[PDB]
Design a protein around this nucleic acid. Structure first.
Length: 162
RNA sequence: AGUAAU
C-alpha cells in the first residue's frame, strides 16, 4: 500500500530475505513483550525530495521496505527490512551532514507511550495489543515471531501490518 | 527540529 512492493514474500530467493530474530527476556514483567522498531523517523526533508529519492539515499546503508512521506510537514516514515539495517542507518548515514536529513527512531507497532524513542524499542503489555496486532505478531512476513506464540519475556523485530 | 498513516 505504502510499501514499494505490496504482495512481496520473505523467502530465500527474494533479495529482501531476512531472518526473524526471536529471543526471550527474564527481566520483563509477566505478560509483557519487547519489540525492536524497524521504523525510522526522518526529518529535515526538502520539498524537492520524493519517496523514491529518500529510499535511494538510504540504499547504500539499508534496503527500504516502505516510505510514508509527509512532504508538507518536512518529515517522513521509513520502514527498513531489518533492525540491523535500521541501527546501521542511525550511526553511519549522513555523518558529514551533507544532506539536511536528521535520522531518529520512530514507532511502527504497539502503543506510542510504550515506546523508548531513545533506545528504539517498545516494552508492551500483552493486553494492550489488539486481536489484529497479536495476529501480525506471529504471522508477519518481515519481523514478528515467525510462528512462535506470544508469551511473557518474548523479544522480536517489529512486524508488518495493514 | 518536524514522530504519522492505521
Amino acid at each position: 500500500n505504502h510499501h514499494l512492493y505490496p504482495d512481496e514474500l520473505n523467502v530465500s530467493n527474494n533479495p529482501h530475505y531476512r531472518p526473524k530474530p526471536v529471543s526471550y527476556d527474564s527481566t520483563l514483567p509477566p505478560d509483557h513483550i519487547k519489540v525492536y522498531s524497524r521504523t525510522l523517523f526522518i526529518g529535515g526533508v526538502p520539498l524537492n525530495m520524493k519517496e523514491w529519492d529518500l529510499a535511494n539515499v538510504l540504499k547504500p546503508f539499508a534496503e527500504v521496505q516502505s516510505v510514508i512521506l509527509n512532504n508538507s510537514r518536512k518529515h517522513a516514515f521509513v520502514k527498513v527490512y531489518s533492525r540491523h539495517e535500521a541501527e546501521n542507518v542511525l550511526q553511519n548515514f549522513n555523518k558529514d551532514g551533507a544532506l539536511p536529513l536528521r535520522t531518529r527512531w520512530g514507532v511502527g507497532f504497539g502503543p506510542r507511550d510504550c515506546c523508548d524513542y531513545q533506545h528504539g524499542y517498545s516494552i508492551i503489555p500483552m493486553h494492550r495489543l489488539t486481536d489484529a496486532d497479536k495476529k501480525w505478531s506471529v504471522s508477519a512476513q518481515w519481523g514478528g515471531t515467525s510462528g512462535q506464540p506470544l508469551v511473557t519475556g518474548i523479544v522480536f523485530e517489529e512486524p508488518d501490518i495493514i
